[PDB]
Design a protein around this ligand. Sequence first.
Ligand SMILES: O=C(O)/C(O)=C/C(=O)c1ccc2[nH]ccc2c1
Ligand SMILES: [Mg+2]
Length: 708
Amino acid sequence: TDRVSVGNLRIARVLYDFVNNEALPGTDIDPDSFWAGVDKVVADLTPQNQALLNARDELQAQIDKWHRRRPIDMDAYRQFLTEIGYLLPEPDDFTITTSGVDAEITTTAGPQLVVPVLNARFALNAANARWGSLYDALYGTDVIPETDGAEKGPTYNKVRGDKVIAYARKFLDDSVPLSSGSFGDATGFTVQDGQLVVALPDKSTGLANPGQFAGYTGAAESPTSVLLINHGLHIEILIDPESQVGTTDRAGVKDVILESAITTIMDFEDSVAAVDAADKVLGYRNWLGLNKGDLAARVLNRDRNYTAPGGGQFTLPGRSLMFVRNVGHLMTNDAIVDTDGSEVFEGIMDALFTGLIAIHGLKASDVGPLINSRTGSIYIVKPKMHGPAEVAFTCELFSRVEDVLGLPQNTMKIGIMDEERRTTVNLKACIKAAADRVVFINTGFLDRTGDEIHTSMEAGPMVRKGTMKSQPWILAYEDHNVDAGLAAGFSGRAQVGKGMWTMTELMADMVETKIAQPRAGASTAWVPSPTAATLHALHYHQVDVAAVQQGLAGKRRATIEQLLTIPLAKELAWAPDEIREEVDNNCQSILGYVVRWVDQGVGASKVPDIHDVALMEDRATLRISSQLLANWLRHGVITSADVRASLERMAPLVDRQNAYRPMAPNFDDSIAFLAAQELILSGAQQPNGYTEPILHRRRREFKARAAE
Ligand SMILES: O=C(O)/C(O)=C/C(=O)c1ccc2[nH]ccc2c1
Ligand SMILES: [Mg+2]
């Protein structure tokens, strides 16, 4: 049909054509030595991949047994885990040796953006979100309360605009402070002899710390803009009295631009639905556009030029340093199949194909104008790993792709996600396994909750979904992550990252609460939009991360006993109503996500919950919900009759909460509905509670039954 024959591999034509005509040219790599390398690498590495997945299952079953066979004694649970190799011994202290890393990762602290790579429009904006308007972000979201007078209507509201402006002025004061006065009384900006002087109504002043003055545009007397700096992040004041917002401003300021999303993660994993070669080629084509510099729908902003505080003409990068998030070790994709017809490990494929593609990010001009890494590294996030032997295996896999691609060893750097229990209680061993390729560690708290629930499925009922964020195990897990990174010398070398803020409409809540992440010494945290990146940039001007990290070293705040504390609910924990509610809540979350996945191949979007509070979540949330319900089922809390009633109930609301095809009132005809049912009912049987097998299968079912 459409398969090409390369050795033991039968590649899909769409993939074979794309790689040949689009990816390879300019890579200075013979289009034949490559595919041989694909064939070799697949053949040689497929064993160990399959052996590691078997290890997971073997381990999972011993744990299922120990709980079935009955209290809960911590010291016993701990000895058992050690006995089974689950809980490996902790290595001697060390320091990572990664090099060739850009400043956005080794040094800068600031928000990290995650965008689905199959959406070029999102992917463009995310790349362009290195710089963002603070007026926009304040005006458009509820950071400035829509009280009275300040309501946000079809036209621009001057009262609301004044409210934004005051917010930004107060921000300026608390970031680049004046030696005397306050930006809110300022009337003009000039640069005179390399210093910056702010025209106050009664006098003039400079910055308290004059070094925070980074540059400017336009003539030094009537500057177009003035560039500030705090905590290694740039602030830009756009000056134009001629403008709309300009005339109303006491110093004629049009805007304040913040350096926001310092890095972005282009995603092939949980934020996309890609079940075939057709799907993977789209994301591949976009990642290529991104690496060349020519992705268009609206284009990638080019770099920003400035005048240094004297006369020199420097430049700043206009884009976010891009990572790519490959899929993990579990799934296979039929984009490539062997002679017997077995599907090829998608993880190995992603390494070969995202690595190849990223070579363009390394070179400018002719067959792309734009450069990702200034230092010659390729940044890859590797999710869903369980233990140091799976980290090691990812090293080796990268070592081999490099050989195939002809890059120096250690080019491809790894972004380690701490989002599986077996990784968590062995994190030091995971970092040691990747000591010379590791550019971050990051707490993937949602997936981590999923694994947490599935690992102890046979122990008893779990606490509700909302109760998880406050649990002893997850607070220990968050801190433990930071101690290990800092111990291994991440400060000034690698990022130390935290999770995603899914409540996309609740920005005031984000601005008030997300500050805790850098306060815990994390040099980066995840946001789901360019706007939330700008707002989360504020926290880094408020919190000196370098120092928090500095005064956290040497400390150990988690014990293994705290990590291993299973989030079990106590006896008589819940009234009948709180259960019905939690059931309805998970069924609506599962329904509204799965329906967009199977029917439209959307892996991440703005989906309203039960109360229409819009949440932008991905498969990790689904993994939590479906595993939670599955767990309550397994342990008596609810029945099978209950699940169906809830699904049946929530379905028509999801339909009304949404091109779209309604699941109600015809339930066993919607493949999506049958998927959401399967996810819950087959939940305990899924390997590690993983949601992709069912999802992939059911999406492919939808694709087929729609061709005619
Ligand atoms: O915690 C995890 O397991 C994790 O890796 C997070 C995510 O991947 C994630 C979550 C929600 C999102 N909304 C938009 C994008 C997005 C991404
Ligand atoms: Mg995850």
